Design a protein around this ligand. Structure first.
Ligand SMILES: *[C@@H]1O[C@H](CO)[C@@H](O[C@@H]2O[C@H](CO)[C@@H](O)[C@H](O)[C@H]2NC(C)=O)[C@H](O)[C@H]1NC(C)=O
Ligand SMILES: *[C@@H]1O[C@H](CO)[C@@H](O[C@@H]2O[C@H](CO)[C@@H](O)[C@H](O)[C@H]2NC(C)=O)[C@H](O)[C@H]1NC(C)=O
Ligand SMILES: *[C@@H]1O[C@H](CO)[C@@H](O)[C@H](O)[C@H]1NC(C)=O
Ligand SMILES: *[C@@H]1O[C@H](CO)[C@@H](O)[C@H](O)[C@H]1NC(C)=O
Ligand SMILES: *[C@@H]1O[C@H](CO)[C@@H](O)[C@H](O)[C@H]1NC(C)=O
Lengths: 984, 48
């Protein structure tokens, strides 16, 4: 029923060409190794309609053209548009007409164990229908096939449904045996590779597998063995929690609504409601209000909005006069008693109270303002009972004609009708000017042992909220740590503190060996508990996909906190340091009898891809407007250029110190008579046309606008010649050519001088000359093989060349950083935008690029200093290692130093140091001193050792016995100080 | 005393700038290879 979709759907994105480069794109793509349903054709007929959704990769195992065309639509009438494709007796017809099973037509070329394939792509991407065709003579089989683009048609229509149509055979019907499959495209990134002709060869989706992500990051289909940063583990907050005081108290809304007797409309009572929590959900659920009108506030945002203050206006009016309580509406109540602003953002609530506010004899306690002198300004309140002067005669405080009391009493009687019944009205003024007035906000129960998002008294953050047993002072609300981050908070209604620890997010890395070795992967998570993310918990995080081993091996791929994973599945373990060996001794000596002269590659970057940046050309190009704008921004460009010139002159002077250490140029004769020490791979052969070493050739073929690259003052040939001179000096004439003339001195006695340097007599060399020569030449051969076959032999130079390369690459891609504008060319900005804003946006873009260039040269100076120190070290170690012997340990390589040979390299140097490495110690016997005639005899330089039979004087590092004569022993005191000394 | 090590600090640019805010992080992704080169420099610090 289910089968693997394998590796189909890969296509060229558009009509652009790419030559031997890898591009990563983000569009709707078909997943890989995807489990796709398998179809059958044979009385059961499966005729499903595949949903288009965002698109499909539709391939067919089609022979003799059973499949003819598709129908796209949703409603199947004239309101929508339907696309129809047919292949009649001559050609393939593309039409768009509204068939009831004309707007657009098109014509293409005539078309006139599984064997045939026909791949089609249905993409509707922003109204574009890119067309691809790929037919190849051949369960979708294992194979590779890309889909070349043919037509990009901007249809501009929405597609949701599609289905393939069949035709019976006329010659009675015959149905063939075949199966087709449909996948789906999703937004994911691929790893495209293009061959030397420019065609797709290997493709990898980034997020398909952890190995796939490693390939996506490293931009290669081959990956070395190691650990690589991939992403960061995002711990998602499980739940949203809100905790507020909002205690029962809430707001005194009841006292206003449920009051016994209200104030009259003219003297309406204003109550300031503040410092409490609103519960308006009750008012809507109350269902006891005759009038419920909210003008400026809607119920959706009403219950969850904050305001500075809210005032409770309440009064009693009649049923007919309720309606005048409305913004814009006026009258006898809304002009003289209480006027709402026409911008009334609030609510109007009223309800019948003929039960309370109606007396049988007549409730005359609720009054109004009938007749007021003028209208009222906003926030004006007429409580004046001043007798009205409705004429010319002044009212001397007495009633009568043209002298009326401005307040008349309501005729509240229970017998009165609906409109005359007393309707109690409460108006809550909503205004905002500090937010002490809020709603319920819903205090959500908290969680434990989970980093989530919380709202504690208006505070938000992410971190685990667990139990804490600390007692802090009651008045303090929340605490902070040394780094000022919040660590605890008090929840209301419990008054208890919760210790907040930073949530468990961390980086993502993939422990993957080389693709040449295997393809199993495991994922490491930085400081992530295994209970929230077979699965193993490290000291550094959670390890998924590997199996921990109690046994501990040697570390090869650091994981974290000492955890290390090696290949068997990939097993991980705590790293084992090594073998516990040292046997501390008192009366035991051991004298070495053998050794190895190992030769180890030592690598130091020397030069960089020195460059000088025309600031104006960089930022602008040839744009006169941009140049005129930029030149007014100061001497930042001059600083940039001059710093780069300093870099360049520094590079040249480091090169001169490294190579032109001697102004006089000695030369190697064609007659390279060294007495059996063949240096062909290091010394350029006079027969070799370009005078470069084979090791240099291996190095060079191993290693791989608007800016310049300045040539080195010493070109590759001239550097090689300098190295040749250095070799000639240090070989034929030895070390003294640094201090002056290349004082010639034969090589065997030069090596004798070197052994005298490390503590060995020249006789030892002369007896060992041939054997050390054979060891040295074999080691040179091993060096040849290691450099030829070792991709990690050039780690340092290859990575420094990289650093320069992707430094310049990020430099050039920075010009492609658009920063939100329409076109980086100024013409489009000016043509489609106003010149004043175009100028400002130009300034923003150019200053962003200027900052970018300054940052680039900042790190360029950083490596300038770094590699400058490294090259100083390089010159120092040619002085101590080529131009002489170094007493320094771990400076000419590992161990006592014997000899060195510089070699040219791109922007750097490579050495073959001769480092003395002992081996196979032999365990022996010694006494503190030898007492002869009561006198202690000590060798001037050697140590007395005995093999079990006789006493001998030999070397500090080796067993070379000799006769203890009068020239190695001296007169000094007696034997009476040593304890246990024997008489010999 | 010679100090030997700092606390290697691989700072995620996206987390530093926007935290877990999806909208802010997505807007940050538009801005370019800034965060990429910064993280590569920081990882260089760590590996050094
Ligand atoms: C160190 O040990 C090696 C063992 O390989 C010695 O080299 C051997 O020497 C014998 C004596 O002539 C030869 O017959 C073998 O062919 C050599 N073997 C190899 C692999 O070269 C070497 O002489 C020893 N050196 C010292 C100083 O003890
Ligand atoms: C030097 O001689 C001493 C003799 O005591 C050696 O010590 C013992 O060597 C044996 C050889 O395998 C071990 O089994 C013992 O465990 C060693 N003794 C102790 C206390 O550990 C010593 O190993 C010899 N060193 C060399 C390099 O041969
Ligand atoms: C009147 O008091 C009750 C208490 O029983 C309260 O629930 C109600 O909300 C009050 N009336 C109004 C209109 O709020
Ligand atoms: C030294 O090496 C070269 C090149 O590998 C080889 O031709 C030569 O025979 C070797 N031996 C001598 C003594 O030159
Ligand atoms: C010790 O060395 C001497 C010098 O060659 C030798 O004569 C003697 O036999 C050696 N002893 C043993 C036990 O091998």
């Amino acid at each position: 029923a289910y089968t693997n979709s394998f590796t189909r759907g890969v296509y060229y994105p558009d009509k652009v060409f790419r030559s031997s480069v890898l591009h990563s794109t983000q569009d709707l793509f078909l997943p890989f190794f995807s489990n796709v349903t398998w179809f059958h054709v044979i009385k059961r007929f499966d005729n499903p309609v595949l949903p288009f959704n965002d698109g499909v990769y539709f391939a067919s195992i089609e022979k003799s053209n059973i499949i003819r065309g598709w129908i796209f639509g949703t409603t199947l009438d004239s309101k929508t548009q339907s696309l129809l494709i047919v292949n009649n007796a001559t050609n393939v017809v593309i039409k768009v007409c509204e068939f009831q099973f004309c707007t657009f037509e098109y014509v293409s070329q005539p078309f006139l164990n599984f064997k045939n394939l026909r791949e089609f792509v249905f993409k509707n991407i922003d109204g574009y229908f890119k067309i691809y065709s790929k037919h190849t003579p051949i369960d979708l089989p294992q194979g590779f096939s890309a889909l070349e683009p043919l037509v990009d048609l901007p249809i501009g229509i929405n597609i949701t449904r599609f289905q393939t149509l069949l035709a019976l055979h006329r010659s009675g019907w015959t149905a063939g045996a075949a199966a087709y499959y449909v996948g789906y495209l999703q937004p994911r990134t691929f790893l495209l590779k293009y061959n030397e002709n420019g065609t797709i060869t290997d493709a990898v989706d980034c997020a398909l597998d952890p190995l796939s992500e490693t390939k996506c990051t490293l931009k290669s289909f081959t990956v070395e063995k190691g650990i690589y940063q991939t992403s960061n583990f995002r711990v998602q907050p499980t739940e949203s929690i809100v905790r507020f005081p909002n205690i029962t108290n809430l707001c005194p809304f009841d006292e206003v609504f449920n009051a016994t007797r209200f104030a009259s409309v003219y003297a309406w009572n204003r109550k300031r409601i503040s410092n409490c929590v609103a519960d308006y959900s009750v008012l809507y659920n109350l269902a006891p209000f005759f009038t419920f009108k909210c003008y400026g506030v809607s119920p959706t945002k009403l219950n969850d909005l904050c305001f500075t203050n809210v005032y409770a206006d309440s009064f009693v009016i009649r049923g007919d006069e309720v309606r005048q309580i409305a913004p814009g509406q006026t009258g006898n109540i809304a002009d003289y008693n209480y006027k709402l602003p026409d911008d009334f953002t609030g609510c109007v609530i009223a309800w019948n109270s003929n039960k309370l506010d109606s007396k049988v004899s007549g409730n005359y306690n609720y009054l109004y303002r009938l007749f007021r002198k003028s209208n009222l300004k906003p926030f004006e309140r007429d409580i004046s009972t001043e007798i009205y002067q409705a004429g010319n005669k002044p009212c001397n405080g007495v009633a009568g004609f043209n002298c009326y009391f401005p307040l008349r009493s309501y005729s509240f009687r229970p017998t009165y009708g609906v409109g005359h019944q007393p309707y109690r009205v409460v108006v809550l003024s909503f205004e905002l000017l500090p937010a002490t007035v809020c709603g319920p906000k819903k205090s959500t129960n908290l969680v434990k042992n989970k980093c989530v998002n919380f709202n504690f008294n208006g505070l938000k953050g992410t971190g685990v909220l667990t139990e804490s047993n600390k007692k802090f002072l009651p008045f303090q609300q929340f605490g902070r740590d040394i780094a000022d981050t919040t660590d605890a908070v008090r929840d209301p209604q419990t008054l208890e503190i919760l210790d907040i620890t930073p949530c468990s997010f961390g980086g993502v890395s993939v422990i993957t060996p080389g693709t040449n070795t295997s393809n199993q992967v495991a994922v490491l998570y930085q400081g992530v508990n295994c209970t929230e993310v077979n699965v193993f918990q490290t000291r550094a995080g959670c390890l998924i996909g590997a199996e921990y081993v109690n046994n501990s091996y040697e570390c090869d791929i650091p994981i974290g906190a000492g955890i290390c994973a090696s290949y068997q599945s990939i097993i991980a373990y705590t790293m084992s340091l090594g073998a516990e060996n040292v046997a501390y001794s008192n009366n035991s000596i051991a004298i070495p009898t053998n050794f190895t002269i190992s030769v180890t590659t030592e690598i130091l970057p020397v030069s960089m891809t020195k460059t000088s940046v025309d600031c104006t050309m960089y930022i602008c190009g040839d744009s006169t407007e941009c140049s005129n704008l930029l030149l007014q921004y100061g001497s930042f460009c001059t600083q940039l250029k001059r710093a780069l010139t300093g870099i360049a002159v520094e590079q040249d002077k480091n090169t001169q110190e490294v190579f032109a250490q001697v102004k006089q140029i000695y030369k190697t004769p064609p007659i390279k008579y060294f007495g059996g020490f063949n240096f062909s791979q290091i010394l350029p052969d006079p027969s070799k046309p370009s005078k470069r070493s084979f090791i240099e050739d291996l190095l060079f073929n191993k290693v791989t606008k608007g800016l310049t690259v300045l040539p080195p003052l010493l070109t590759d040939e001239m550097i090689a010649q300098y190295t040749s001179a250095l070799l000639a000096g240090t070989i034929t004439s030895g070390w003294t050519f640094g201090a002056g003339a290349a004082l010639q001195i034969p090589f065997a006695m030069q090596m004798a001088y070197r052994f005298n340097g490390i503590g060995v007599t020249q006789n030892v060399l002369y007896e060992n000359q041939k054997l050390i020569a054979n060891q040295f030449n074999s080691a040179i051969g091993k060096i040849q093989d290691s450099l030829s076959s070792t991709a990690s032999a050039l780690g340092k130079l290859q990575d420094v060349v990289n650093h320069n390369a992707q430094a310049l690459n990020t430099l050039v891609k920075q010009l492609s950083s658009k920063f939100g504008a329409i076109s980086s060319v100024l013409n489009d900005i000016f043509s489609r935008l106003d010149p004043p804003e175009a100028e400002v946006q130009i300034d923003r873009l150019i200053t962003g690029r200027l900052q970018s260039l300054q940052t680039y040269v900042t790190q360029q100076l950083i490596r300038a200093a770094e590699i400058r120190a490294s090259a100083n070290l390089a010159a120092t170690k040619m002085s101590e290692c080529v131009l002489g012997q170094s007493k320094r340990v771990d400076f000419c390589g590992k161990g006592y130093h014997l000899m060195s040979f510089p070699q040219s390299a791109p922007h750097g140097v490579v050495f073959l140091h001769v480092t003395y490495v002992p081996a196979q110690e032999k365990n022996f016997t010694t006494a503190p001193a030898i007492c002869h005639d009561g006198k202690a005899h000590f060798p001037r330089e050697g140590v007395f050792v005995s093999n079990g039979t006789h006493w001998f004087v030999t070397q500090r590092n080796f067993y070379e016995p000799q006769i203890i004569t009068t020239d190695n022993t001296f007169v000094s005191g007696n034997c009476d100080v040593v304890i246990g000394i024997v008489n010999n």
